[PDB]
Ligand binder design. Structure first.
Ligand SMILES: CCCCCCCCCCCCCCCC(=O)O
Ligand SMILES: CCCCCCCCCCCCCCCC(=O)O
Lengths: 149, 149
């Protein structure tokens, strides 16, 4: 991944996000509800490390989860306990494109449970470079459900 | 779906095809190997009805399958025993875009086990109109395996 947000102010990504679309390099990273990269972002809490609240389906349950992405020399790049989180683009107010890699998955996050075509076309343009083999998107009804059910 | 091949000569789609990419309106139509619209086209045999040889994963097996799409008043539209098959576009030599609907799934077929970007971008342009929520694509290795394993 060769796209990163110049001048990312991590404080300003704080609060509520919705996983509107997801893509991955391999189908099995996203194909089932229990697929490894099938994580739904709930809330981003910058400490300047980054606390992520996400939902994730495990052994027949939607589980609420709290993880820390440690900051790096680069403001737009964080690490996870192996896995690099890259923030590609964000306008802070409406959307945020990020990828994670050790296997590569990218997401289009939005502030509100709505379908944002402006954001999805930025997401699409940003995956054109990447070797993605699965893409998903969720309707507003699924954005309000635990684990996008 | 509002895109159909003008002047389709069905005889000329005869022979060998590879399911290079697939999209569907609902994730559960494509997400597992046993998902309903997760069918891999092997061979198209026009009689002028259309005989399809496809592969389909059922109860832990890749099953070879033979079905008939009955012709309609419209050359580019066929029916299946409920389900409409629409041929959107084909150059006969390299690629063929088709959709099926009762739930909507579209595929980008190619003559050879290779990744055709020209064809995938035509596929992408053709799904821009459609309310797709899952897309898959397969590498050349998977195109040569039973059920794209
Ligand atoms: C801008 C920051 C975006 C947020 C990035 C979220 C990435 C977190 C995903 C990491 C996967 C860890 C999930 C739990 C581990 C597991 O169940 O195996
Ligand atoms: C240009 C023609 C393209 C070929 C169209 C192929 C569509 C066939 C898919 C129909 C699904 C039927 C599969 C078996 C039925 C089942 O297992 O439920």
């Amino acid at each position: 991944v060769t796209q990163t947000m110049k001048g990312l102010d991590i404080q300003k990504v704080a609060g509520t996000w919705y996983s509107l679309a997801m893509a991955a390099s391999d189908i099995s990273l996203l194909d089932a509800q229990s697929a490894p990269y099938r994580v739904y972002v709930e809330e981003l809490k910058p400490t300047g490390d980054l606390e992520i609240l996400l939902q994730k389906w495990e052994n027949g349950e939607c589980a609420q989860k709290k993880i820390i992405a440690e900051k790096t020399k680069i403001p737009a790049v964080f690490k996870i306990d192996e896995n690099k989180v890259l923030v590609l683009d964000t306008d802070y107010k409406k959307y945020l494109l990020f990828c994670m890699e050790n296997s590569l998955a990218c997401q289009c996050l939005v502030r509100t449970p709505e379908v944002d075509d402006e954001a999805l076309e930025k997401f699409d343009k940003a995956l054109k470079a990447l070797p993605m083999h699965i893409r998903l998107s969720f309707n507003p009804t699924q954005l309000e459900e635990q684990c996008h059910i």
